[PDB]
Amino acid sequence: VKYDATVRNSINQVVQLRYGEDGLAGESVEFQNLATLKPSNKAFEKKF
């Protein structure tokens, strides 16, 4: 990763615009639940 936060090869070939498509390193990521995809339309409207 160069300091433009663009992953690049040895000869400066852009492999990824941002690391992992988001620019977030792997040591500070956790598992979470979206809690919005699964609930139905009625439940979604009731809860939001």
């Binding site: 663009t6 852009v14 615009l17 941002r18 992992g20 498509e21």
Partner: protein, 209 residues
């Protein structure tokens, strides 16, 4: 038989209209959405010596930005398309003073005919498509993400923004089925919008070579 040939022609025509619309052309919505019965009633019924003759299925359509490109798809009838067919196609290509045209081969095309297409198209751009290629619209496949062709000024804006060079960008083969489907000359850049399970959406740039 006649029914299977009708189904194949219907799918080919629908995919051709889809390709024209994606490339950007004056394709009417009704023309894009044609049912099998509509195809039967509109360009004749049974093929194989019926009204469908593989010559009246040619399509003329103009470009959105300027109605002068007038891309014009062909439909050769022979199983193999032999130089004299390309010659008469070129006569018609010049006579109707258009620039872009496509060819839908049934089975295959000769090495000499490929040679003629590639060398004899600095002014008359022509493209190849095998018949089975058009039975499925590759864009609608789940794996293939959405593709968008980038204009030159947008490419310059991108290069200025990221301070890259043309060589440094990722590359995509000119013979890739998607590139052929979009009909894009070397040196252009295609924007790719794919889904990702870590960012929600990713913009990726491929430079055809």
């Amino acid at each position: 038989d006649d029914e299977e040939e009708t189904y194949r022609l219907w799918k080919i025509r629908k995919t051709i209209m889809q390709l024209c619309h994606d490339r950007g052309y004056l394709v009417t919505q009704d023309e894009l959405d044609q049912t099998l019965e509509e195809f039967k009633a509109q360009f004749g019924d049974k093929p194989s010596e019926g009204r469908p003759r593989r010559t009246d299925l040619t399509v003329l359509v103009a470009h959105n930005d300027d109605p002068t490109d007038q891309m014009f798809v062909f439909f050769p009838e022979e199983p193999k398309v032999g130089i004299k067919t390309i010659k008469v196609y070129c006569q018609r290509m010049q006579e109707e003073n258009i620039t872009r045209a496509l060819i839908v081969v049934q089975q295959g095309m000769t090495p000499s005919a490929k040679q003629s297409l590639v060398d004899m198209a600095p002014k008359y751009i022509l493209e190849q498509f095998l018949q089975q290629e058009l039975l499925i619209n590759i864009t609608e496949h789940e794996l293939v993400p959405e593709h968008v062709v980038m204009t030159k000024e947008e490419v310059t804006e991108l290069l200025a923004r990221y301070k890259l060079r043309e060589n440094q960008l990722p590359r995509i083969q000119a013979g890739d089925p998607v590139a052929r489907y979009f009909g894009i000359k070397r040196g252009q850049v295609v924007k790719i919008i794919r889904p990702s399970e870590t960012a929600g959406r990713y913009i990726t740039y491929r430079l055809v070579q």
